[PDB]
Amino acid sequence: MTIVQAAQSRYSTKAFDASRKLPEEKVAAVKELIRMSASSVNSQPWHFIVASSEEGKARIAKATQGGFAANERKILDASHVVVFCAKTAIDEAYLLDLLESEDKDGRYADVEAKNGMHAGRSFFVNMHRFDLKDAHHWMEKQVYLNVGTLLLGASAMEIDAVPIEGFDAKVLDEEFGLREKGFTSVVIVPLGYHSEDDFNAKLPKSRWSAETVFTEI
Amino acid sequence: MTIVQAAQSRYSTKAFDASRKLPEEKVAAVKELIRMSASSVNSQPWHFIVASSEEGKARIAKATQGGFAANERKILDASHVVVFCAKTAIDEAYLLDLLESEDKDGRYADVEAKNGMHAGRSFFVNMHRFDLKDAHHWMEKQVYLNVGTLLLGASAMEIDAVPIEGFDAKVLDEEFGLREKGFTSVVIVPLGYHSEDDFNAKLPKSRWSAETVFTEI
Ligand SMILES: Cc1cc2nc3c(=O)[nH]c(=O)nc-3n(C[C@H](O)[C@H](O)[C@H](O)COP(=O)(O)O)c2cc1C
Ligand SMILES: Cc1cc2nc3c(=O)[nH]c(=O)nc-3n(C[C@H](O)[C@H](O)[C@H](O)COP(=O)(O)O)c2cc1C
């Protein structure tokens, strides 16, 4: 299957088959894929909650009650659920921890290259913190880029998924103590195999035409 | 090559081989991949500029001058460059045009299902416009999700890429009249084949460990 066929055949699963679980190899591949995502200045401004148990899924589904109840069964019936969380703030200590992990990983030949990268990344993060004043939105954008990798990657691995914004992030954040750890939930992605009765598995994919969305130069 | 190997082997290209051009089949596959991206409520709040000519690339590179000059040669030497643009605002007319494209595409059995989807999508877009007051950030997040699909997809198609935030979006917007058309440039992605002298092609990829970024439940 080509990556284009993966993009054409994936869809938002509206009903999972609660009997069908992902093999351990597919779960380990999902986790490696999202840890490896690109991010502006290698900020990696993310944390991931992975639920593989009925108790874990029930805890996440506390955030899909009332007006969000249409998403509850997607969480409960999926095999595995990934909660994508973004950093709520960014500071020099996080940037120094990041620079040290890259130094340990062999990215800097000398202290000159290391100091240079810090000064560059610092200039840039501070532009988002203090000049655009949008650092939380900028970090959540990197987390959405990560989600995109998972939606395409899941399809290429023949895994059904649905991205979910329709949840109460205060309830989910409190469920896992995320705000006191500097994180906030932004997207829920349940993973598994769609049920035969998934209405959306039998609808055509709808997108703007290429002549609408492309300007060629 | 598995999708995990695609995530492990891709990297941010810092120097392209200006002699090496993408085959027409690879360019058409990139364009189909990004048109097919998922987005919240199928908002597809995007437009794409694709430059395949020296003149096109020179026009985009006007936005990588002065403090952004470190990105100029990535644009000039790449085979093809994709500018990802987000909508600057969203209203009922865009939502009615979207609902009509989905109706034409066969997503609604009856006017009941159509009216239901409009009322649901409208409630939700209006929550971003008027309650969170973050509609432009919410739309740009969908465009970043799209970029993620391209970074992973390019790697699976054996195409080098680099995502670029380091550009002057006012200069790029004015270059293509985007703001008067309701769009703004958010990410530049040059595509092609890295040059042998790309320093970053010989550095290890650096990410947080799985024990840092995962909570298992
Ligand atoms: C949104 C975004 C914007 C980026 N902007 C730039 C840029 O302006 N110039 C640059 O050289 N690299 C840029 N990068 C590349 C990142 O530094 C890179 O993705 C990160 O260090 C992870 O390394 P990798 O892409 O080699 O795996 C950007 C990446 C992302 C995700
Ligand atoms: C950020 C994001 C959030 C989403 N939130 C929900 C949700 O809460 N519930 C839902 O059923 N679908 C949700 N979707 C699925 C979209 O409606 C779907 O991606 C879009 O209609 C395109 O269709 P496709 O994913 O079938 O190709 C979401 C998608 C994205 C990208």
Numbering used by the authors:
A (entry chain A), B (entry chain A): 1 to 217
The authors write:
Of particular interest are type I (oxygen independent) bacterial nitroreductases, which are flavoenzymes that catalyse the concerted transfer of two electrons from reduced nicotinamide adenine dinucleotide (phosphate) (NAD(P)H) to the nitro group of the substrate. This results in the formation of a reduced nitroso intermediate, which subsequently undergoes further reduction to generate the final hydroxylamine or amine product(s). Instead, active site amino acid residues act to stabilise the charge on the reduced form of the flavin mononucleotide (FMN) cofactor and form binding pockets that position the substrate, NADPH and FMN at optimal distances for efficient hydride transfer. Each dimer has two active sites, formed at this interface and comprised of residues from both monomers.
